[PDB]
Symmetry: C6
Subunit: 266 residues, 6 copies
C-alpha cells in the first residue's frame, strides 16, 4: 500500500474577469471623450459623445411634423362640430316635417365620416409618436455609455477623430474588470484529460517569486491553441486582485495536482 | 509458393467536432444580452443572445398604427356604403311610381357600386400592410440569437456589450459544436491515397492516453487535400463515440489504417 | 543521316475539368444545405436554401397591391357602364330634340374619358405584374442550385451560418467535374517554345509508379507562375478518370516529346 | 545591524506627443483645398482643408427654394383667411336681421376656422423645412476640415487633389500633435512592474544629448502592456516640458527609475 | 592621342504585353454565360460573357408599362381638349348674337387654354420617362460583358457560374492582352539610368532561344522605378514584333543596351 | 583659440516636389484615358473620362421635369388672366350696382390666390434649376481632370477597366512635378538636434560621383521612420532639376555642416 500522484507545471497567463470594447453605432466626429486609461467607471456612466447635432435636427424635423397633424385634427373637429349640429337641428325639424328622411339620412352619414375623420388623423398623430421615438433613440446613440463596470483598459479612438460605422463598427475604448482576474493555464494535450475541475493549483509571478496565490481550477477551454506547432489547452481558476498586483498578460508559473489519493500500493 | 500480401500505413491524424457551425446575425445594433457561457450544452433553437431591439419595436408601432389609420379610414367608407345603399333602395321604390327618371336610378345605383369598390380598395390596403407587419415582426426575430443546432459553445467571439454592424460582414457571436461523436481526419499521403477504400478498419490513440486504443472503419476521404509545405496529403475520416468528455478539438492522434489483407493465395 | 529529338521532364499537377464555387446573391441565414462533400449533383439540382420568409412577405405585399388596382378597374368600369348609357339615352333623345348637341357633346366626351379610364388602371395592373415577377425572381434567389454537374468538392459555408452579400458575394460550396481531369505541367521558359500542341507526353503518379497515362497536349497557358523566382508555364493534355484514381493537386511526373523526326543527320 | 535597501532600474523608454489625434472627414468628394503644411502650429478650430462643396451648395438652394414655394403657398391661404373672415363678420351683422338662418352663420363661421387651421398646417411645413435647412447647412460644415486641437502637423496623409470617399472608412487628412509637453513611455519589465508607484522620481537622456539629464516623476502605468517578441513589458509614463524644439517623436531615451529608498532602519 | 570612349550595359530585362487590361462589371448578379476560353483572339466590342439579366428585363417592363399608363392617361386629356375646343367655337358663334355675356366666353375660352396645358404637362411626363427607359435600357448593356480591346485572354478570374457582387469592388472576369507587339522592360541600374537616351539601339535573346538575337531601339523609361530588395532599378522599354506566337508573358530576356559610341575624336 | 565643427553624412532619397494620385468619385467603365507615363500635363487638362451616358440620362430626366412645371405656370397664368378680368369687370359693375361687395370680395380674393399661384410653381421652376445643376456637376464628375501641373508618374488604372467608388475611391493615375525635386535625408536621432534649418549640405548621385549639387536645408520632418529597428529623421533642402537627371527614389550621398564657427579654442 504505497502512493502515486502527479503534478503538471505550466506557464499561465493572467487575464481580467470581464473585458469589453465599447462601440459606436453612429458616424460623425467624436466630440467629447471623458476618460483616459486608469479611470474607473460605473455601469452606465456616459463614456463619450459623438456629434449629435444632425441627429438633433432629425428631431426638429419630426416634432414639426407632429404639429402639422396637430392642426389638422383641429380642422377635423371643426368639421365635426358643424356636421353634428346640422344633424340635430334637422333631427328636430324631422318630427316637425322640414327635412323628411333623405336629407336626415345624408346628414347623419356625414356625422359619421367626420367621426371617422378625427380617427384617421389621430392614428397619424399616433404613428408619428413612434417616428419621434425612433428618431430619438438615435440621439441615445450619440451617447457612448458603458456596457459593464470596470477600468478603462485602452482608448483606440481619441477625442477629435472621425468615426463612420456604415460598414464596420468602430472601437472607441475598452474596459475590463480587474477585481477578480483569471489565469488561463497552458496544459498540453499530452496531459489534459488528467486535468479535472476542482483540483488544487497555485502560482507565483516572476517579479517576486515567493508570495504564492492559491486557487482551485473551475474552468477548461474546449478550444486549444498551437504553440510552436504543438496544441495546448487553457485551464482556469479564480484569484482575487483586491489591490493593484497582477495585470493583463502578466506571466505566471502554474502548479496543478491531478492525482493525490494516498495509500493503495502502485 | 503460396503467401499473402498486405500493407499497413500509420498516420498522424487530427481530431475534431462531428458538427460545428458559426452563428452570427443579420441585424446591427449592440449585443445587449448574451445568455450562454463558454461551455454550456444547449437544445436546438435555444436563445443564446439578444441584440438591441428598441428599434424594431419602433417600426412595429409605426406599422400597427398605419393599420389603425386604415382601420378607421375604412369605418368612414363603411358609412358611405349605407348612404348610397339605402338611397338606392328608397329610390327604387319611389322609382316604380317614377322618381327622377331612370337616369338618376342608375346614377345612384352605380353610386352604390363605386362606394362598394372603395371598401375593397381599402380591405386590400390593410392586407398589404398586414403583410408589412410580418416584415416588421420578422426582423424582431433577427434580434434574438438562437442556437441552430444542439451542442456546446466551443467559443465566444462577439462578447456582451460589444457592438456589431451586419451591413458588410455578418458578425460572429459564438461557435457551437456537436461533440457527441468526433471525426478524426487521418492525414494520409497522396502516395497511399491511391488505395484506402471506404470502411477499412483502423485504430488510433491520443498522445496522453498511452494505451486505451480506439477504433472503427473509415467513412470517406475529402476530394480537396492540402499541402503541409511539401507532400500532398488527404484526409481519411472517422466516426467514434466521444462520451466521458474526452477527445477535445484538434487533439492529436496516432492513426494506423489497414490497407488490405488478402491472405492465403497466389501472390 | 542520323537522329535528333528531345524530351522534357516536368512536375505536373492534376486538376478537375470544370470547378465552380457556388454563391448566394441574397443575405440571411442558410436554413438548409442538402449535400456534404462526396455527394454528386446534377445540373440544376437544388443545393441549398437561404431564409426566404422575408422575400416571401415581399410577395404578399405585392399581390395585395395587385388586388387594390383590381377593385379600382371595377370602379372604372362602373363609371363606364353609367357614362355609356347616359350617352345613348341622349343620343336618342337627340333626333327627338331633348338634348340638342352641347349636352350630347359633353356626354360623349365623358364616354371617352371613362374609356381612357380602365386603360390608365389596366396599365397599372400590368406594371405590377412586373413588380410581382421582379419580387419573385428574388425568391428564386433563395434557392441555391448548381451552375454545372459535378462533385461537391468543398463546403466553406455550412448549415446554420449567416450570409450577407451586401458588399461581397459569399461562397457556399464548390463543385468540380472529375470525369475528365487536367494535368497542368510545369515546363520552364528555357524550353516552352519547343513545346507544341499535339505532342506525345505521358505520366505516372507517385504512389504506384508503373501504370502510365497516355495523352497528347492540347493546351498551353500564356500566363506563367514564378517558382523559387524562376518563371514556368503550364502545358496541358486530357486524361479520363472513369474511376476514383487521380485527385485534385495530386502530383505527377510528366514526359513530353518535342521533336522526334528520324533520319536526316545532325 | 542597521542598513538600507533600495533598488534602481534603468529602462530603454520611448518619447512621444503629449496629445496626438488623427483628423478625417465625414463627407466624400475631392479635397479641393488644403491650407497647412507638414509643420505649422495651428490654433483650435483653425481651418486646415476644404472638400469639394458644389454639392451641398446645391442641396441648400434646393431647400431654400422649397421654403419659398411654401413661402408663397401660404400667401395664398392668407387671402382665404380674409374671405371667410370678412364674410363671417358681414354675415353676423346681416344675421341679426336674420340672414340665411343660423346654419349658414355656423357653416361660414366654421369656414373661418378651417381656413385658420390651413395656415398652421403651413407654418409647420416651413418650420419643418426650416429644420431641414439646418440639416443642409450642417453638411456644409462637414466639407471644411478644422483643427480639433492645437498643435503641429506631425504628418499629411491625404494630399491636395487626392479624392476621398467616406462611406466606408473615414479618411485621414493630417495628424496634429500637441508637442508642448512630451510623455516618455519607459518600457519597464513585468518583473519590475510589481513595484513602481505613481510619482516616483526618475531621470533620462537622449542618445544624442550626451549629458543634459532630464527628470521628473512618473504619472502612471498603462494596464495594457505589450510584448517585444519575448518578455512582457509595461509603460511607465512621463511629463516633461519640451520647449526649444527638442524631443522629436519616437526619439529614444535611456530612462532610470528609482524604485525605493527607505534608508536607515532595520533591514 | 586620338581615341574613342563608349560604354555598354547588359541587363536582365523582362517581357510583356504591349497592351493589357482587366475587364470587370458594374452590375451584380450571377455570371450565367461566359463565351470565351483561356486563349481565343477576340475582335473589339466582342461579347465575352453575360450576367443574370432577368432583373433589368423586369425593370424595363415596369417602365414601358408606365409609359403606357401615361400613354392612355393622355388619351383622356385629348378628349377634354375637344370639349373645351368645340364649345369655345360654338360659343363664339352664339356669342356674336350675345350668348351668356363675355364672362362665359372668356371663362370657356381660357378653359381651352387650361386643357391645352394639361396635354403638355403630360407630353413632358412621357419624355421624362422616355429618358428613364434609356436608363433602364442602359443597365441592360451592363449585363453583357464585351471586349474593350482586341487581343487574347491571358486569364479567366471569374468563372462561369460563380456569382459576382459589384457594390464594393468591381469584379474581374477575364484579362485580355494585345500580344501583337511586346514591350521588354530592361531593368537597368539607377547608376546607369543617368545615361540611356530615347532611341538608343539594343539587342537581347531569350534563355531558351540560344542565338536568334532580337533588337531595336529603346522608347523611354518609367519615372517610377522599383527596388529589388536593394539597388534602385528603372525600366527601359522595347517595341519588337511578336509574330509566330513566341514571346510569352514575363518570359525572361538578356538585354544589352549601347549607351554611346562617339568614335574618332579627342578623348 | 582653435576650431571645432562637425559634418554628418547620411543616405538620402530624391523625391518630386508635388506628387498627386488622381481619383474618380464616380463608378462605371473608364472609356477613354488620354495619357501614358511621360506625358506632361497642364493644370485642368482633361486626363480621362469614365462612362457618362447614365449621368447624362440623369439630365434628360431632369430638364424634362423642368418643362413640366413650365407648362404648369402656363396654366396658372391663364387662370390669372381670367380671374383678373372678372375682377375689374365687376370692380366696374360695382359703382353701378351689379355686384355689391360680397361677390367683389370673393373676386379679389381669387385674384390673389391666382397671384400666389404662379409663385408656388415658380419656386418649383426654381428649385429644379438647382436639381439640374446638382445632376450636372456629376457629369462634371465623369471628366477626370488634373489637380496640379506635373508629369504622369504612373497609371494604375488603364483604359478598359471598370471603376466603382461606392465604398473606396479608386486610383486612376498619378502625376508629379519634377522641376524642383526634394532630398529627404536620413540623419539619425543620435544627431538631429544638431541639424538646424539653413545649414550647408551637398550630395552626389551614385552613377556619376563628381558633379555635386549644392543646397541649404529648409525642412525637417517631426515624423521619423525606423530602419533595422533604429529611428531616423528626414532632413530636407531644395535642388532644381531643369533637365532629366534625378528621378524618384534615386539614391544620394548627403553632406551636412552642423557647426563651422571658426577660432574660439576647444
Amino acid at each position: 500500500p504505497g502512493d502515486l500522484q502527479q503534478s503538471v507545471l505550466a506557464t499561465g497567463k493572467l487575464d481580467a474577469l470581464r473585458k469589453v470594447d465599447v462601440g459606436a453605432q453612429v458616424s460623425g466626429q467624436l466630440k467629447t471623450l471623458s476618460v483616459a486609461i486608469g479611470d474607473k467607471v460605473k455601469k452606465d456612466q456616459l463614456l463619450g459623445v459623438i456629434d449629435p447635432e444632425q441627429a438633433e435636427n432629425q428631431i426638429k424635423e419630426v416634432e414639426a411634423t407632429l404639429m402639422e397633424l396637430r392642426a389638422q385634427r383641429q380642422q377635423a373637429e371643426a368639421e365635426l362640430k358643424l356636421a353634428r349640429v346640422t344633424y340635430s337641428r334637422q333631427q328636430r325639424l324631422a318630427q316637425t316635417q322640414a327635412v323628411s328622411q333623405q336629407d336626415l339620412d345624408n346628414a347623419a352619414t356625414e356625422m359619421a365620416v367626420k367621426q371617422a375623420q378625427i380617427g384617421t388623423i389621430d392614428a397619424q398623430i399616433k404613428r408619428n409618436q413612434a417616428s419621434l421615438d425612433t428618431a430619438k433613440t438615435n440621439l441615445d446613440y450619440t451617447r457612448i455609455v458603458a456596457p459593464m463596470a470596470g477600468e478603462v483598459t485602452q482608448i483606440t479612438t481619441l477625442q477629435g477623430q472621425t468615426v463612420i460605422a456604415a460598414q464596420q463598427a468602430p472601437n472607441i475604448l475598452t474596459l475590463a474588470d480587474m477585481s477578480a482576474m483569471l489565469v488561463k493555464a497552458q496544459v498540453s494535450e499530452a496531459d489534459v484529460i488528467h486535468l479535472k475541475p476542482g483540483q488544487k493549483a497555485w502560482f507565483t509571478v516572476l517579479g517576486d517569486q515567493l508570495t504564492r496565490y492559491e486557487g482551485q481550477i473551475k474552468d477548461v477551454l474546449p478550444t486549444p491553441e498551437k504553440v510552436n506547432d504543438a496544441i495546448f489547452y487553457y485551464a482556469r481558476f479564480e484569484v482575487p486582485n483586491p489591490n493593484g498586483l497582477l495585470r493583463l498578460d502578466m506571466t505566471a508559473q502554474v502548479h496543478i495536482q491531478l492525482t493525490d489519493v494516498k495509500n493503495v500500493l502502485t
